[PDB]
Amino acid sequence: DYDYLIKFLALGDSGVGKTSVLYQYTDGKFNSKFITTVGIDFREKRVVYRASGPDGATGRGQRIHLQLWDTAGLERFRSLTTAFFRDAMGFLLLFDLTNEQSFLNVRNWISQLQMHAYSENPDIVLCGNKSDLEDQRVVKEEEAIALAEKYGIPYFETSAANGTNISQAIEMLLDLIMKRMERS
Amino acid sequence: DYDYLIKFLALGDSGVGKTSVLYQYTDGKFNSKFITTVGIDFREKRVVYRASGPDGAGRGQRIHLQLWDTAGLERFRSLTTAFFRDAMGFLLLFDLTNEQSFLNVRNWISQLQMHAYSENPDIVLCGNKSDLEDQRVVKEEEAIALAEKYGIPYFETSAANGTNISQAIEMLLDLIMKRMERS
């Protein structure tokens, strides 16, 4: 917890890859078999955080203890009305680039986030996951990018399988929180 | 809506009834069929805490209780975590019908004192499944002696019919509300 203890919540429909993304990030491992998440779960990771200026000037690293919470997609919107949910400092919102319906549901997810989080405008990073399945891809990149611009949130196309953009997307979310918080 | 968010953690061997004790407490419901907890889970309840008055004196605070359920098969693994050191109090369960789960209470307490936010965290010891008297194997005197040696409260509970569940949880709540600073 050494400099800061930061907690994130991963959300999205069942099957989009939440568990696989957090597991690829913390352990660099991937499993093809679908074991759907029941209840919740979490992984922790010590990482070094390096602030970036508007010019790109990089400050000295700070030790972050990251607590990454994983949710059950089958209990869609089950209890966003808990104190647990209101303690999430930021949200990694996922959809599946091979599942158009999971992408069409992103607007509703963002709506539910803003109504139930600690703040009306919490930090969000949108991930289009499973980018490694080029032949199965159905979500149009231009439309994901347009949607991200509309809500003003970063967008990354990620793969839990091969790791592409997983660190970047989580690091961007960390950057939004570190920038936003009040310090002593 | 609430005056205090209080987080407790239930612990103990797989099978002793952690999930069932929280579920009976928050919802008044109970399921016979065993489904082992994977990872972690939680439940929440808004309660009213009226303080232990001296001389008999009132001052009821709205508590938002957050009750965390652990996977008993993960055993001592997530003791390593910042999560664990954020738990304010421990509901330590054994199975009145399982001697081995009782024999394991010593090491659970040792593990707790080694990894909690305090070397002496508040613990309430629960001998669960008191409704299965015909299958009981843990003698009340032994359980009471063990609690006395460590100085922690002991309750015999049943997640099936609710006996002593609220009393045990309110006892833990009381310990924390008296130990916390600015109350």
């Binding site: 800061y4 930061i6 209101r86 139930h116 703040s119 009306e120 929180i177 936003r180 918080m181 009040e182 | -």
Partner: peptide
């Protein structure tokens, strides 16, 4: 982190 529905304590905020 201060929010209109809840202030999250960070071990600032």
């Amino acid at each position: 982190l201060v929010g209109s529905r809840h202030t999250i304590a960070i071990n600032x905020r």
